[PDB]
Amino acid sequence: VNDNGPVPSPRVFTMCDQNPEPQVLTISDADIPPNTYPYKVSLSHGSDLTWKAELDSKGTSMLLSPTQQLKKGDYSIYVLLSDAQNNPQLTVVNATVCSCEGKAIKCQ
Ligand SMILES: *[C@@H]1O[C@H](CO)[C@@H](O)[C@H](O)[C@H]1NC(C)=O
Ligand SMILES: *[C@@H]1O[C@H](CO)[C@@H](O)[C@H](O)[C@H]1NC(C)=O
Ligand SMILES: [Ca+2]
Numbered sequence: 563v564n565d566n567g568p569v570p571s572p573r574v575f576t577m578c579d580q581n582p583e584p585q586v587l588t589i590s591d592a593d594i595p596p597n598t599y600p601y602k603v604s605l606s607h608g609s610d611l612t613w614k615a616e617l618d619s620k621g622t623s624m625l626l627s628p629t630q631q632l633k634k635g636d637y638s639i640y641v642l643l644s645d646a647q648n649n650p651q652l653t654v655v656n657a658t659v660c661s662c663e664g665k666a667i668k669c670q
């Protein structure tokens with residue numbers, strides 16, 4: 563039966579300041595195929611606190627990148643996927659930012 567729905571791999575980032583590079587994130591389903599066939603990524607209240615969604619070509623991961631030069635640490639991003647649809651709701655995959663240039667660094 564297709565019970566569960568899609569979910570992001572890492573739940574906490576360490577973005578950088580000056581020019582953060584894409585925060586790689588992926589997807590996982592508890593179901594058995596077809597039930598986990600391809601997706602549809604969606605961003606809920608903050609679909610713009612600047613956050614822009616993306617899929618890897620070979621299916622599984624998603625590319626998460628801002629679109630604003632935003633602030634000094636601690637804040638989430640509401641995520642939302644689907645697989646037959648099922649639609650999950652995912653959620654918050656918070657984001658810890660600390661001073662910088664462009665590579666995902668160890669934080670503070
Ligand atoms: C503590 O809670 C805040 C509020 O969401 C969060 O930003 C932070 O990452 C949590 N832990 C630490 C060590 O900051
Ligand atoms: C993410 O950080 C916020 C800000 O403190 C916190 O309220 C939340 O519980 C953390 N994680 C999730 C999944 O919401
Ligand atoms: Ca099942």
Ligand SMILES: [Ca+2]
Nearest residue numbers: 566567593597
């Ligand atoms: Ca499923």
